[PDB]
Structure formats: C-alpha cells, structure tokens
Design a protein around this ligand. Structure first.
Ligand SMILES: [Cl-]
Ligand SMILES: [Cl-]
Ligand SMILES: [Mg+2]
Ligand SMILES: [Mg+2]
Ligand SMILES: [Zn+2]
Ligand SMILES: [Zn+2]
Lengths: 231, 231
C-alpha cells in the first residue's frame, strides 16, 4: 500500500496458508496433543483461563514471535512496554506475571528450559524490513502472519503490538548498541505460559532468512505447541 | 471503565485543562516564540516537514513523554520498537533518523545538550499505574494527556504508542534489572527534532509524583517548546 494511504493494522501485505488454515476449529486445541505451526507461518490458539501452553523449539534455533489478546477484545493485549516497568526487568523469567496494556495479568511465564534469552525490544518483521534488506517482491513476515492468523478466527487487530521474540538473542552491550548473536536455545527447548484471562495467543515462526549472523542466515523452521487443560 | 468493557485508546479516564486548551490555534505555533506546556498536562504541536522543534527542560529534572503522529493518520506514529532495530541501539543520539511503524523516517534527532540519557522502554503512566502505587481517586497521567491533547485538535488515536521518555534515567544493569535513577539533565537542557513528514507531536509533562528516587519524589514542573521554520 502506498504511503499516501493510511496504515491499517489488520490489512495483510500478502498471503500464505496462514490466511486459511487453522490448527483446530476456532483455535481450540485438543489437550495434551502436539500441533505444529509451519515454518514461515502463524497460527492463533484460544486458551481458557487457567490453561497452559507449551511452545517448543522443534529444531532448536528458531525465533517465535508471540502475542496474546484478550478474548473478545483485540484492543487489550500482552504489552512489552507495560511488562517491563511492572517487572522492573527487560525480559521475563519463570514465575513472572506478564501484563496487558491495562497493567493486569494476562499470562504467567511458568517454565523456560533454555538459558532464558528472549527479546522484548524489537518489532515484528514486515514487508518494509525485507525491502530495506534488499529483497525483491513479497516476503513472508511476522506482522502479516499475525494479521492472517487472527483473521482466520474472524478477528482483526486494531494495532500491531510489539512481539515477545522467543529465543531471540540480541543483547544490548556497553555503550547502548544492540548486538546480533545466534540463539542459545537447543532442540526441544520449551517455554510454558499459563492464561490468566481467556485469551487468543498468536505465534509466528519468523521467516527471517536474509540476515547473516556469525556467517550464516537463519533457516526458518517450524514450532510445536501443546495445550494443557486447567486442573 | 470496568474491564468487562473493551479498552479504548482514545477514551480519557479523567480530565484536566489539556482537554480544552491548545498552545495556539490548530497546534500551529508562531515561529521562534517560546510556549510553555503546563506541569502535569499535555499539548499537541503541528509541524510541517522540515521544521524543527526544541523541547526544553525548563526547570531541569522533568520527564517529557513524547509522541509523533503522521498528519492525517494517527495510525502511523513514531514507534519505539521500530526505532530500535533500525538504529541497532536502545535510545537515540543526535544525527539519528527516528522511524515510524512503517520504518520510514518521521523525525531526526538533531541536538541534545544533556548527557544523552532517555528511556524508550517504558509505557506512559496511566490510571492503572497510580492505582497500583496506592493512589485514591483520579491522578493526572500521560496516557490521558495524550488522548486529551489529540482530542483538542479533533484527533483520536487508534493505539497508545510507547512514549519516548525524554530525560528519564532508568538504566538496565547487569543481570537484566531496570534501576531507577534521578535524571542527569540540568535546567535549560534541550533536545531538537526535525520533522521528516508533516506531523502532530504530543508532549506530556509527566505528573509522576509518588515514586521516591534517592529519597525524594519527583515534583512535576512544566516544559518549554519553540518551533523553528523550514529554511
Ligand atoms: Cl503499510
Ligand atoms: Cl482501561
Ligand atoms: Mg553462506
Ligand atoms: Mg520526603
Ligand atoms: Zn519475523
Ligand atoms: Zn507520565
């Protein structure tokens, strides 16, 4: 879309199967069954309050862009800029209550088998990022994956929140620069979240494949999820 | 508003003179004249592409919450989570082009007479923050100031972006904690921004007055602004 036209948080800039495939009807997963979010794509997952969701780094080096919205109101969402002052920390650890843009609990991070490195600072990739990196034509991207995954449940975001970039390792070094590093996750590492409200979670398997880190571009792969019922 | 009702980015939670007073008609300041944004309040300022805006820490210790929106489209705005990966830095320095949520230039930071400490990580204060700190009844807050200042020009935001928290000194220390510190600004310190598009800037003189740092609460004071014409 030409920049003379207004920005539209809900409008995808292109298409992939995220527009039409859902993990299960209504995003309501069967409990204790593993589902796979394909490489380069996003999916939405409904959770009832008290349920838990495992997100598993299936192949070990993949970044997962993670969002959560209140059921019935995409205008209230897990909010990185509210998360940080509430915890007085840049990124969450197991036991931390993660808040919405109303500063109320929306999720609790319960487990993290990795060394605990994640990024809360960086926007989701989008077509403008790929154009800036030299790419010709459409590139799959996390912002479009969010839009499509929500759209497949009949939902439209009114803003694109900052993702929680699961397993992304971009530390801030002395002097204020952000330094690209490879992930420190390993195959099978997981995080576990508990829903503190009824929510819609969205996860995008980031398709970034144009940024050499330590001599090699990322190679987009899938992520696994598994829902645990409320006891 | 009860949390059973949806979040509304444009709806103020209370009132102060920001709802009805503007610095000048339409936010169009007379060039090279100093205007004062009162303590605890916000104001909107229109800028044409190529104009510059000085923001002056009138009394020296005040935090200014700063936003910018594209003229004609509050859905496109100066975006902290896009600013950071574009600069590969946590906070901007003079010479840095600051981008919108479309990753295009919206402002350039031209000058900063302070030591250069600002925060891009923390949400604007809101009624929920003050309730969490123990406050009874309405408290002035930056999120409401944003809403009111835009409303006084006939504008309604569709999301509350993260502010740039001018002169806020909350460094991230080894281990990942954020540490409260007093500002390092001095009386008369300024920043200068150039508009790279026609924009609406909003500045809130943060009314935070309940958080003791180094034994003393902040004491909200005013901020000064001055517009420079396009040469
Ligand atoms: Cl766009
Ligand atoms: Cl609210
Ligand atoms: Mg190679
Ligand atoms: Mg005292
Ligand atoms: Zn991505
Ligand atoms: Zn404030």
């Amino acid at each position: 879309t030409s920049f003379d036209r207004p920005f539209e948080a809900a409008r995808p800039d292109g298409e992939n199967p995220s527009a039409h495939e859902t993990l299960a009807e209504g995003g309501r997963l069967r409990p204790e069954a593993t589902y796979t979010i394909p490489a380069r794509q996003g999916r939405a997952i409904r959770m009832a309050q008290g349920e838990a969701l495992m997100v598993i780094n299936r192949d070990g080096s993949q970044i997962g862009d993670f969002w959560a919205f209140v059921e019935g109101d995409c205008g209230e969402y897990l909010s990185m800029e509210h998360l940080r002052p509430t915890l007085r920390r840049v990124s969450p650890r197991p036991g931390d209550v993660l808040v919405s843009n109303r500063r109320r609990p929306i999720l609790t991070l319960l487990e993290d088998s990795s060394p605990g490195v994640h990024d809360t600072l960086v926007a989701s990739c989008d077509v403008h990022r790929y154009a800036q990196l030299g790419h010709e034509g459409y590139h799959d991207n996390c912002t479009d994956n969010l839009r499509m995954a929500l759209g497949a449940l009949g939902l439209r975001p009114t803003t694109v929140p900052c993702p929680l970039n699961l397993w992304m390792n971009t530390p801030v070094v002395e002097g204020g620069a952000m330094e690209w590093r490879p992930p420190v996750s390993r195959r099978g590492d997981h995080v576990l979240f508990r829903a503190e409200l009824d929510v819609v979670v969205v996860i995008s398997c980031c398709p970034m494949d144009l940024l050499p880190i330590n001599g090699e571009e990322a190679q987009p792969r899938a992520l696994d999820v598994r829902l645990r019922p409320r006891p």
